């Protein structure tokens, strides 16, 4: 087990388990290296430092999800509101059923344990901005198709949706007995969309088909 | 009582800059200007100290929430809405209280440390119960929409408040406590409350008492 034989995915899988178990602060390069079956030099073979490791764990789940959201605004389909619902609701289900995904999402939610460091906060800012941009674009396509209520601002709508969804994610992390990621994510999403979306455009409470492709 | 208050203040300054993990009772003492003996008299450990910090803020907030369901006034939605709007305003205008609140909202680093998640859980449960009591009184008074379930309305209100607070801690310039907090509150209340019950978009008068 020479350090240079470690693969990037094995380094990231090991680091994500370290971070889930010990948190960001207590995780060290030596711990990540040992966990993957090597020593710290196997981590250096891929990443300058622990924050690059964190960024890469985040990117690996945030990238795919941003891709899904981006598809909801396509001019090749004429149901952007339904598509946004398909993406979000299946994401909620996935987060609820896949502990590994859920624990990475919870690493980001938890953020920096003190004002001393802003390392997770900047990644969160950049992620929030990415998600908002994409939701706002889907909502702008919905307006053109006459699917929004008169006067609905798609930028405000996107901001309200992120707020009530973010709140469900934080609540479920704190007290899963009281706040249910699937059930309440879907209620927050539908409630928020119904404030900005015309009646009759989608049926609240329904499970959409996974977005095609 | 007042030495208590001094430790707590200093502990606020440490907890916010340094975090829950790296702060100890000895660091808190020094900034506070007191002896280790003096400090231990009040709090034998960091968690006892955090519990009294959260308490200081969380308690009187729960007392404001609790009042909105009083069987003595007939405007529970208006009152609950007023409490949250005023709270949002106060947080936005008082950096002291806003730092104490972020200490209160930040998560434990791991799934292994908890005692701060334990007060979050208890705090989360207290706030939801009180929201639900005010919305059930609204329901009794004919102020909720047909078929609105006060338990469900309170969960959505709670998620709404929590998403605004968290949104603003990450991106103050993208999530404005006062302006987006009021928009989000009014949106979620209008999903469950009949029209004409409160006046949206405005800051209500101070509640009595
Ligand atoms: O996009 C992300 C950004 C960060 Cl900073 C951390 C995790 C991420 O991944 C997700 C976030 C929210 C939802 Cl609802 C679903 C997924 Cl997969
Ligand atoms: O802001 C968001 C709003 C919505 Cl409705 C969906 C996903 C969002 O994106 C995130 C949610 C949580 C974390 Cl930790 C990171 C990111 Cl990017």
Residue numbers in the entry:
A (entry chain A): 6 to 218
B (entry chain B): 10 to 218
Copy text from the publication.
The expression of SmeDEF is regulated by SmeT, a transcriptional repressor encoded upstream of smeDEF in the complementary DNA strand. SmeT belongs to the TetR family of transcriptional repressors. The members of this family show a characteristic helix-turn-helix DNA-binding motif at their N-terminal end and a C-terminal region involved in both dimerization and effector binding. The binding of SmeT to its operator region simultaneously represses smeDEF and smeT transcription by the steric interference of RNA polymerase binding to DNA.
The structure of the SmeT-triclosan complex involves one homodimer in the asymmetric unit, as seen for other TetR family members. A closer inspection of the electron density maps in the C-terminal domain showed a clear density in one of the subunits (A). This density was readily interpretable and allows the unambiguous placement of two molecules of the biocide (in agreement with the stoichiometry determined by fluorescence measurements) and the subsequent refinement. One of the triclosan (TCL1) molecules binds to the bottom of the ligand binding site, in close contact with helices α6, α7 and α8. The phenolic hydroxyl group forms a strong hydrogen bond with the Nδ atom of His167 (placed at 2.2 Å), anchoring this molecule almost parallel to helix α8. The hydroxyl group of the phenolic ring of TCL2 forms an H-bond with the Nδ atom of His67 (2.3 Å). The 2,4-dichlorophenoxy ring of TCL2 stacks against the phenol ring of Phe70 (3.4 Å). Residues 10–12, 21–34 and 45–55 that appeared disordered in apo SmeT become well ordered upon triclosan binding. However, no equivalent dense area was seen in subunit B. The volume of the triangle-shaped ligand binding cavity is 1030 Å3, which represents a notable increase with respect to the volume calculated for the apo SmeT structure (630 Å3), but similar to the calculated values for other TetR proteins. Due to the stabilization of the SmeT structure, the distance between the α-3 recognition helices of both subunits could be measured in the SmeT-triclosan complex, with 44.6 Å between the C-alpha atoms of Tyr49 (the N terminal of subunit B in the apo SmeT structure had to be modeled in order to estimate this length). This value is 10 Å longer than the distance between the B-form DNA major grooves, where these helices should bind.
